[PDB]
Amino acid sequence: DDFAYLNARVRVRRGTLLKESFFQEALDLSFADFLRLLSETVYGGELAGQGLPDVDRAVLRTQAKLVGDLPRLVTGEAREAVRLLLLRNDLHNLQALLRAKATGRPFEEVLLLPGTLREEVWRQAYEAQDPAGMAQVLAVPGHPLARALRAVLRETQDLARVEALLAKRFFEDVAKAAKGLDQPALRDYLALEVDAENLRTAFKLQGSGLAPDAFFLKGGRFVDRVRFARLMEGDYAVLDELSGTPFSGLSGVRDLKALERGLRCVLLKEAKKGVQDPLGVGLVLAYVKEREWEAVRLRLLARRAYFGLPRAQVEEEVVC
Amino acid sequence: AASGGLDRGLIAVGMGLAVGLAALGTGVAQARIGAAGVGAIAEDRSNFGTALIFLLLPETLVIFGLLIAFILNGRL
Amino acid sequence: AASGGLDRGLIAVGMGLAVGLAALGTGVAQARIGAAGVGAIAEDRSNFGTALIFLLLPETLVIFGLLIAFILNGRL
Amino acid sequence: AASGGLDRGLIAVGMGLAVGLAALGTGVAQARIGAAGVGAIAEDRSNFGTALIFLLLPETLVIFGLLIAFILNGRL
Amino acid sequence: AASGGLDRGLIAVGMGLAVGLAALGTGVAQARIGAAGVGAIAEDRSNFGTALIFLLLPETLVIFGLLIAFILNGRL
Amino acid sequence: AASGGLDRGLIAVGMGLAVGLAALGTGVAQARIGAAGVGAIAEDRSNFGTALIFLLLPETLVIFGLLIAFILNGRL
Amino acid sequence: AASGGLDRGLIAVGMGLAVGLAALGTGVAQARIGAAGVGAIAEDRSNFGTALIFLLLPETLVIFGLLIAFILNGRL
Amino acid sequence: AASGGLDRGLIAVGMGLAVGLAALGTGVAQARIGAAGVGAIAEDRSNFGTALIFLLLPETLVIFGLLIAFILNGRL
Amino acid sequence: AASGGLDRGLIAVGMGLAVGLAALGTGVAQARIGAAGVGAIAEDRSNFGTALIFLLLPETLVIFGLLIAFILNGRL
Amino acid sequence: AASGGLDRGLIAVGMGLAVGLAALGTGVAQARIGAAGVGAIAEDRSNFGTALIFLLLPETLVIFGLLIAFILNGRL
Amino acid sequence: AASGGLDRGLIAVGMGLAVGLAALGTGVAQARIGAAGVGAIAEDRSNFGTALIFLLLPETLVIFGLLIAFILNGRL
Amino acid sequence: AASGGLDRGLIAVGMGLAVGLAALGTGVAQARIGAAGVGAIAEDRSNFGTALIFLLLPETLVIFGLLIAFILNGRL
Amino acid sequence: AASGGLDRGLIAVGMGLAVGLAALGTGVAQARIGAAGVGAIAEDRSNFGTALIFLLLPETLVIFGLLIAFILNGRL
Amino acid sequence: VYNPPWAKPFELLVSFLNTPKYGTFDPTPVVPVFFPFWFGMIVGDIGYALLFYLVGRWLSGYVKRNEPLVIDLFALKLKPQVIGKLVHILNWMVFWTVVWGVIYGEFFGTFLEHLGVFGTPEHPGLIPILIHRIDTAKTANLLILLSVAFGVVLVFFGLALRAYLGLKHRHMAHFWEGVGYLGGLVGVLALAASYLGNLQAGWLQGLMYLGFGVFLLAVLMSRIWLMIPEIFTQAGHILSHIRIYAVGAAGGILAGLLTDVGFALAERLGLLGVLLGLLVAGVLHLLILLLTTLGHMLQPIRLLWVEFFTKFGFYEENGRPYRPFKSVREA
């Protein structure tokens, strides 16, 4: 819709993000000190445990209520865009349900995050005895995962292939839709992310040598099949060709750890472009990403603090 | 009353248009901004005074029309 | 009005349009706040009072049309 | 019309417009709020009570156009 | 066939704008809420009745025009 | 038939607006709902009938313009 | 044959409004739905047939302008 | 041939509105749909024909105005 | 008011439109800026002066129209 | 000097409406589609010819008017 | 006025419209640019110089209307 | 010679509207496509020539009003 | 008071609409592009010159009205 | 560790009067330009202004018939008791507002009645005030031009101080800004006279005008400026003072025209029962009317804020250190 209501909600929420210095501060703490530091920020209102998993829960609970609510207000057009972001998180979870279902593992110890779909949707879905029945559970308001699933379900009920292609198909759905709206910024974020995801997919599998088409996602803007293939043959020279683009740092990066670390920074720059859009979804989109990056930092730094592992070992990870 | 002077009939009509046009401008103005305000209540009970004051400024537009309306007719 | 002639009819004409424009302006003003509004009560049940204060305000535009209309009557 | 009368034709054109414009306003108002409304049942069965209060308020706009219109014709 | 004076045409014309303009209002209203509406049916059979009742509510604007048209004839 | 007089010329005009305006209103109604609808079908051949009937309903507005045109004809 | 009477120009104007207005309604109606329509074909060639019926339904608006134009000949 | 008079002047006028109104409707019809098609083009050369067939159909509206213009004409 | 020629009806009529058009333009101008601002407050008090400052600027438009109204009024 | 007769002035007017109004409708068709196209080129170099072709299609509508206008010249 | 002259009345009218339309345009021009600005300022004090530079472009519209208005005056 | 007839004026007015209106259309056409263009450089230096070339294309419409005006002028 | 020749009023009215409509067109044109324009500047002081080139194409719209105004004026 | 209305906010602006950070001045003189006018914003008669008294009596006082203005001297509200106690300082400053607003109800009501100056009855016998007499071109005009005048002075107040920022710091850039805009004033005044008497000047100063444009541009060109266009908007500031003041009149008048249907006469042919026939709608409408004029008083602050928050020899410049001054002078 009108992004008026939404924007305002995000602005208050933007009020509880910390400053750089928090993250800077967290580094010389102890776990005790962490417990106190954490207890004074907004997450602190659900901090009251004493162990590390309790921190994880605090994050979960805080994010559950502060983000997990937002599309749900009304599912207006703008809300639909937002719905896509959070939906990506359901997709992973959904996939987790597919593996869980397939070896039938007592579901109850599979713990899925809150996304947009309700907890009872997961439980019922589990009680839906087939991926077709499951898709019908999803089908109820009309859901892009339903549709991705319907398209995939025709070719095989081979679980693993289904998970891969379902995700692949899901981003194909997202791509058409995102291209379909008035959100140059979303079109860009999705697009760079797709490219980045391909690039990483290609990077990670070096030393398999398979046919590229099984792994090449759709939505590119800097990744074409030929480069993709080339990296999949192991040719790193692919990485020197996207210099000057938003991917300029890809020169000389031949390890995965560093690669993702850089890539994550690039997408961070993209989230920052769309800043404070009453124009549309640019602002909410940015907020969501920011909260994740915060979350990453809370949990990791909590752990770092918890076990007292060297400061220097971790410092790069919050450093873009 | 009755039928006489075209001038009186003609002027009364055009008087409305000034008032009406401004009203239209106010309505559009209030709708976006006014809506933005509802979120404000949610955000801060404290900021609320700002939200109300922001809505107010467009209504002045209407007032110019009334002023103009009076001068045009209202002297009979 | 009643039985009359040509001068009165023109002033009668402009009366409706004046009224219509403000009415329309009110509707657009109501639509945006109103749509947001059903959600606002939901989010903030305490805020329901705010919703009451809010809802009244756009309607004011039409009232201006009446003010100009009342004064116009006196020859209509 | 029917018999002569200079006034009557002039008022008749504009008679439709006063009402028509208010009706058009009623529609814009309803379109956004109503849209908010369909979701509202889904979130809360409860929100129907809000929904009853909400819908009426735009409807007032039509009633006014007809009221002034009654004064134009309904006297003759 | 039949014809009239300068006066007669104005009532003949003006009947249409009232109904048409209001009709335009009903459509904008119905379209948005209706558009929103369809998912509710899909999910739940139970929500359908309200949505159905909802669509009538803007349409009332048209009915007034038809009435204004009926009374107008007999002067036409 | 043939040429006529000035009064008749007026009688044709507002008649076009009665049909045209209703059609225009119907078009907005069709556009928003029409866009929403297709997914229900896509999933279910079975759901089509409700959708079909829904889309059908605003269209009645148009017939009213023709009704006004029919009653009028043989007076132009 | 050439020219015509004083009357004819007035009827000529209003024939266009009837047709034009419905057409305008058609364009908006078709545009929104048409946009919704294209993705289904790409995914499923089979679903083009439903989509095909969908577009068709607004087209009746265009026809109404031709019908009113046809009957009018008899005055032109 | 040669000149006529007052009648011709009116007819040219309503002719323009007829074509123009249709043109505007066409513009909207083509604009949304036309944009939607291109993505289909991006994916498939195979779907391109569908997009092509789609675009033409709204353009008919202008043609319809012109048909009506010819009937007006023959004195033009 | 009073009366004093054909001239007066013309000078009065078009005068309003100058004001009205500017007023309408101001309202839209104000609506976009007005909405954006509230978010600035929410995040921060410091920009609030700016939020106010943004609002000040469109209002100049209204007055220029008012100058035109003023000179025109100033012969009556 | 170089004044013309009654016939000519009116007809020239109604010719323009066709040219301007269509210019606006075509522009609307081009804007959405045109915008879509630049994104297509970036993605797909092969598609550029199609994109180029796409823009051509609305511009024709105005041109139909120009042809009728051309014919008017040589009497006009 | 104090003496007639219908002719003077037309120029008096048109002096305003030039002014009104440009004003109307300035407002829309300001609204999109302005809105972007509040965020821009917030983010960057540095972006402010641009924000100011931006404001300059809308001012041009008003100047023209007035220019034409001025040239017209010195005759009235 | 500064003076002349009403007749010259009749043809002149409707000619002007053509020029104003098309220009207005060109701007909207330009605005969406124009919006795409700044982004086009950022992403692609390669798209810049094309995007830039695209902008020119609705503009021919504007030229048509001027051309028709020039040829018409110098008889007036 | 005072009265001028037949020429001035008709040409004057339509002169204004030509500039005003184009001016309005410029505003919408500026508004989309201009809004787009700021993000590039904020990031890129360097990309700015092209952004300047983007604004430039819309600037023609005011000029067209003026060009036509020069030939017309002096008949005033 | 470990008069009164005039003095109270004046004492808090004093702390920033003593602060050294420029050789320019602070917004302490602000209090007498604002204060009367703020009160004179209240305009009205029998059905309105002359009833504002009651409102005041509940503030510095209360009446216990008021559901949330229970015992306000000991503060009880729909917000905290403490806030109520603290804003005793305010409750009085508002009360003073009420005392003067009632007074400007008679100030307004001078031109609303008598047989001293208007040839119709001494006080209308139904209710005094029945038709507000100001619709005469002249009667209105003098009240319009009156409002303008307090604004022209405010233009002076800023630009002098502004020029002083650049004078006393040797910011040639601030000096040039202040000076050029005072050049600007000369051209405005030429054109205005040619419409204000029509023929008062306009050739006294309308041929001086050719030389007035020269008075303008001398120091703008010395700064060169890249935002040379901005001088339009600077003309918009001269006019703004007029315009707000104009609104202050018009919105005022609008307020007044509601008593002519809301307390005077609007129902029935005319009777001596019309007094109690009219109150049925009148009373509801009254509070809505009341609210809006609260909005109107923010027009002043904004007016001031045009100068204040935008550096005309002042700290705040779209924010900055130094805090919303409105909120400071209130006490």
Residue numbers in the entry:
A (entry chain M): 3 to 322
B (entry chain Y), C (entry chain X), D (entry chain W), E (entry chain V), F (entry chain U), G (entry chain T), ...: 5 to 80
N (entry chain N): 302 to 303, 323 to 651
Provide the publication's sentences verbatim.
The a-subunit is connected to the A3B3 stator in the V1 domain by two peripheral EG stalks which form a peripheral stator apparatus (A3B3E2G2a1).
After refinements, 57.9 % of the particles corresponded to state1 and gave maps at a resolution of 5.0 Å, higher than those of state2 at 6.7 Å resolution and state3 at 7.5 Å, containing 15.2% and 6.3% of the particles, respectively. Local resolution analysis by Resmap22 for state1 showed a range of resolution from ~ 4 Å in the V1 region to ~ 5 Å in the Vo domain, indicating conformational heterogeneity within the complex. Local resolution of the hydrophobic region, especially of the c12 ring, was limited to ~ 6 Å due to conformational heterogeneity even within the most populated state1 structure. In order to improve resolution of the Vo domain, we employed the focused classification by using signal subtraction of hydrophilic region for state1, as described in Supplementary Figure 3. The improved map of state1 at 5.0 Å resolution allowed us to build a model of the whole complex. The inclined α-helices a-TM7 and a-TM8 are intimately associated with the c12 ring composed of 12 c-subunits, each with two transmembrane α-helices joined by a short loop on the cytoplasmic side. The density for a-TM7, where the R563 is located, is in close proximity to the center of an outer helix of the c-subunit. The cytoplasmic cavity provides direct access to the hydrophilic residues on a-TM7, reaching the Arg-Glu pair between a-TM7 and the outer helix of c-subunit, suggesting that this cavity corresponds to the cytoplasmic half channel. The periplasmic cavity in the center of micelle shell faces the helix bundle composed of a-TM1, a-TM2, and a-TM3, including a line of hydrophilic residues, and connects to the aqueous hole giving an access to the inclined helices.
